[PDB]
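Subject: design request, 224 residues
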């Protein structure tokens, strides 16, 4: 399959990304609590449902929530202000809450069954969100003595996600909380790392890790 791109809603961020986030790729966004990672996730869950002329892929979405932060009301707001029908947009998001890191891993296997079911339809899965990818792994494997096993489980989880992205032509989008009092970047595992932070006057700033884009959080999700 060719590489598809999903617009983020921000022309600034799209330019930094070369057009949007890529299918057949894992995009990892990391930053402090409150930097706006979940707002970018909510916006992408709407954008992917637009036609390609508007930066979408006419796609379905699968969302794995580890922290109870998915907000259907926010999806409705973004959809309404992107000229879509909010009921239709929500109908094409499949949502699940991961109870712990082992259940989170099983949900990715279940995701593959639904991906196969929609593969040959007019609304194939094009976006798989894991928000937040590391939180259960961090809370369940505390202490230096457990770090080796934590890394083992995380590496298998990421390999599973890599496989789905490439095999089924899906954009995988994962968030990761990293700050002074806790958090670890996903080493070299993601296809692409995006650092997100707050700036003066409520602006958000994005940089590619291994220019900068600037945008706001609005009723449209994010925008310049
Ligand atoms: C934990 C209870 C649920 N079981 N399923 C749900 N919603 C549908 C569903 C099923 C599998 C999934 N894999 C990733 C997202 C996703 C969504 S909610």
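Subject: RE: design request

Done. Sequence follows.
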């Amino acid at each position: 399959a060719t590489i598809g791109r999903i617009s983020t809603g921000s022309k600034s961020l799209d330019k930094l990304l070369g057009g949007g986030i890529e299918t057949q790729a894992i995009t990892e966004v990391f930053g402090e609590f409150g930097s706006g990672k979940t707002q970018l996730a909510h916006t992408l869950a709407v954008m992917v449902q637009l036609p390609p002329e508007e930066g979408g892929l006419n796609g379905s979405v699968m969302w794995i929530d580890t922290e109870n932060t998915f907000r259907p009301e926010r999806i409705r707001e973004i959809a309404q202000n992107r000229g879509l029908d909010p009921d239709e947009v929500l109908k094409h998001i499949a949502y699940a809450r991961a109870f712990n890191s082992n259940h989170q891993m099983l949900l990715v296997q279940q995701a593959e069954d639904m991906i196969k079911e929609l593969l040959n339809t007019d609304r194939p899965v094009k976006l798989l969100i894991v928000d937040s990818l590391t939180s259960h792994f961090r809370s369940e494997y505390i202490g230096r003595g457990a770090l080796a096993e934590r890394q083992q489980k995380l590496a298998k989880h990421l390999a599973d996600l890599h496989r789905l992205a490439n095999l089924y032509d899906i954009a995988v989008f994962v968030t990761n909380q990293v700050q002074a009092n806790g958090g670890h970047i996903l080493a070299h595992s993601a296809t692409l790392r995006v650092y997100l932070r707050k700036g003066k006057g409520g602006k958000r700033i994005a940089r590619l890790i291994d220019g900068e884009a600037v945008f706001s959080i609005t009723e449209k999700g994010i925008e310049d």
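The first strand starts at residue 5 and ends at 6.
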